[PDB]
Amino acid sequence: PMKKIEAIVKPFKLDDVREALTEIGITGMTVSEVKGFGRVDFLPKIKIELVLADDAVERAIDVIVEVARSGKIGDGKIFVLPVEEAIRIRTGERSDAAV
Amino acid sequence: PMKKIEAIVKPFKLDDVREALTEIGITGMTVSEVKGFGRVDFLPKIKIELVLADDAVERAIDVIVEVARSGKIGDGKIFVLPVEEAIRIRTGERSDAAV
Amino acid sequence: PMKKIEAIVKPFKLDDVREALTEIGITGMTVSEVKGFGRVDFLPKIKIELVLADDAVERAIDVIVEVARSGKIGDGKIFVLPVEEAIRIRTGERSDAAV
C-alpha cells in the first residue's frame, strides 16, 4: 500500500529537507511554488510531494519535522493521503520513493 | 478525521472566496497557478487547497459555491479527498483550517 | 465513485497526452509546472490532473502510458487517489472528466 505526503514549507528549506530524506533512502520528489495564506496577506511557500510505501511514511514525516521545526509560527504543514495506484510509466512497476 | 478540499476557480475570484471562508472561521489555505483545459486551448485558473475537519467540509463547500456559481460555463470545480494525517510542524498538533 | 489521476511527465508530452485522452472521451484537465528531483539536481516537469469515474481510470492510465512510455529513465509517474466528492460549481452535479 502506498501513501502520498504533501509538505508545505518555507522556500529556503528545500535543500535541508532533500538531503535529510536522501539520508534515509528517499529521493524522488516533485516541488511546486505556491502562495500561503493564514498565519500583503500571503508569503511564498513550496509544496513538496512524494509517494512512498506506507511503512516509510513515519520516518519520512519525522525527518521533515526535524529539519523544519523551529518552535515559532510558519514552520509549515504535512498532510498524508491514501494512494490506490503508484505507477512507474517505464515498466508498470510501482513508483516508490522509498524504493 | 480530516479532509482536503481542492477548488479550481477563475483567478479573479480569490479575494471573494477567501473572505467568504474567513467569515465562517476558515483561514489557512494554499494557492497555486494552473492552466485549465476542457470547457489557445486553455485559460489560467487558480487551485485553492485547504485541509480541515470533516464536520466543516459541507459549509465550506456551500460558501465556495455561493461566491463562484454564476450559472454559466467555467464556474469551476470542487474536489474532496480523504486525509489520514494533518500535522502542524511546529508542535505535532493537528493542522485544521477550521481550527 | 470518483478517482483522481495525477500524472508527472516531461513538459513536451502535454499535446500527445491531451489528444490521446480526448480520443477516448476525456477532456477536462488541470496542468501545473513543477520541478522533478530523483532519477542542477532537477528538471522541469508538468503535473496533469483529472478527476473521473472509477470505471474510466484503467483506460485513461493505459493511454497515458502508451504515449509516454519510451523504455528509458524519466518516462514519468502516475498516481491514483480516492475522491469523496466531485462537484461542478455551476449546478452541483458531479464533475466527471469521462462525463
Automatic annotation (TrEMBL), chains A, B, C:
Its domain of life?
A: Bacteria
**What molecular functions are annotated in GO for this chain?**
ATP binding; enzyme regulator activity
Q: Which GO terms describe its biological process?
A: regulation of nitrogen utilization
Arranged from A to Z, the UniProt key words for this protein are: Nucleotide-binding, Phosphoprotein, Transcription, Transcription regulation
The record ties this protein, via SUPFAM superfamilies, to:
GlnB-like
InterPro entries (UniProt xref): N-reg_PII, N-reg_PII-like_a/b, N-reg_PII/ATP_PRibTrfase_C, N-reg_PII_CS, N-reg_PII_urydylation_site
Cell membrane as a keyword? no
User: Which GO CC annotations does the UniProt entry carry?
Assistant: cytosol
Q: Which Gene3D superfamilies match?
A: 3.30.70.120
**A Pfam family it matches:** P-II
Query: Is Zinc among the key words of this record?
Result: no
Q: Could you say which protein family the record assigns here? A: Belongs to the P(II) protein family.
Q: How does it assemble?
A: Homotrimer.
Q: What protein does this entry describe?
A: Nitrogen regulatory protein P-II
Q: Which organism is it from?
A: Neisseria meningitidis
